[PDB]
Specification:
The chain has 278 residues and is of the alpha/beta class. Strands 2-1-3-4 form a 4-stranded parallel beta sheet, with helices on both faces. It has a two-stranded parallel sheet with strand order 5-6. Helix 5 runs parallel beside helix 9. The chain is built from 9 helices and 8 strands. This is Manganese ABC transporter substrate-binding lipoprotein PsaA.
Length: 278
């Protein structure tokens, strides 16, 4: 079978929905781990060296900072757009501080479903090119899976459009929901920007608290992957309750709520819409 490596559980789950059991799939960053700052283990190095096809997020998720993915593919002697492919190719990127320069792209593209669909399209394209015997199967699965994501995307947009505008603000610890904000029309506010060295200082908390006191936002949210003490402080200082824990950069463990890219997104979209309608 085609040997495929995915960098994280979101990309691996989308890949499973296109390829089923036709491939031999290995995922590097385990469920619930950090897909930006990860140290590959010997098994990841071996599997990447042997792979026919490698999928990564791109847009600086795994190539910034310690650039773990760049080192991995260079040591594995794998070539860009031959052996490895960025599943975000074609997304309408968002830049940090609104400054268009290569390396300033915000990586969190999958938090809108139109981009999950683009991820799936790129995965199906490259599986078909490397394994043409199953091309019809990949194309069929792509159509079925993108229809499922598209339905959730339209349903979710209808929910958010109904919410009184004064309540529509997605508040999280890190600014990881800009793609969600762009697609669903819910502006973002957060404690620290992506790539800040200091996470949750008194100055950052105070800055967000002062912004939120001037708003009518009824609920706050907190990521399951971050220390919740900064947002709990923001919640107490503003008297705005934390409605729910939400997913950011991993799906849930198998058998739990949110254990696929689709179910992770359905949980997030439904809980954010519920909390903001309060």
């Amino acid at each position: 079978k085609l040997k495929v490596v995915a960098t994280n559980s979101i990309i691996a789950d989308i890949t499973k929905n296109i390829a089923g059991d036709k491939i031999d799939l290995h995922s590097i960053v385990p469920i619930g781990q950090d897909p930006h700052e990860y140290e590959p283990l010997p098994e990841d190095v071996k599997k990447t060296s042997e792979a026919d096809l490698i999928f990564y997020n791109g847009i600086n998720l795994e190539t910034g900072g310690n650039a773990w993915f760049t080192k991995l593919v260079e040591n594995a002697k794998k070539t860009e757009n031959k052996d490895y492919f960025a599943v975000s190719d074609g997304v309408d990127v968002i830049y940090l501080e609104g400054q268009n320069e290569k390396g300033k792209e915000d990586p969190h593209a999958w938090l809108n479903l139109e981009n999950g669909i683009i991820f799936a399209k790129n995965i199906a394209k490259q599986l078909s090119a490397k394994d043409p015997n199953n091309k019809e199967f990949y194309e069929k699965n792509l159509k079925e899976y993108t229809d499922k994501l598209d339905k959730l995307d339209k349903e979710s947009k209808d929910k958010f459009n109904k919410i009184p505008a004064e309540k529509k603000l997605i508040v999280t610890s890190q600014g990881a929901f800009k793609y969600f904000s762009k697609a669903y029309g819910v502006p973002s506010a957060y404690i620290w920007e992506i790539n800040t060295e200091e996470e949750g200082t008194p100055e950052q908390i105070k800055t967000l608290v002062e912004k939120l006191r001037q708003t009518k936002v009824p609920s706050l949210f907190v990521e399951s992957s971050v220390d919740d003490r900064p947002m709990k402080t923001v919640s107490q200082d503003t008297n705005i309750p934390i409605y729910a824990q939400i997913f950011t950069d991993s799906i849930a463990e198998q058998g739990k709520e949110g254990d696929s890219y689709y179910s992770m997104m359905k949980y997030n979209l439904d809980k954010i819409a519920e909390g903001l309608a309060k």
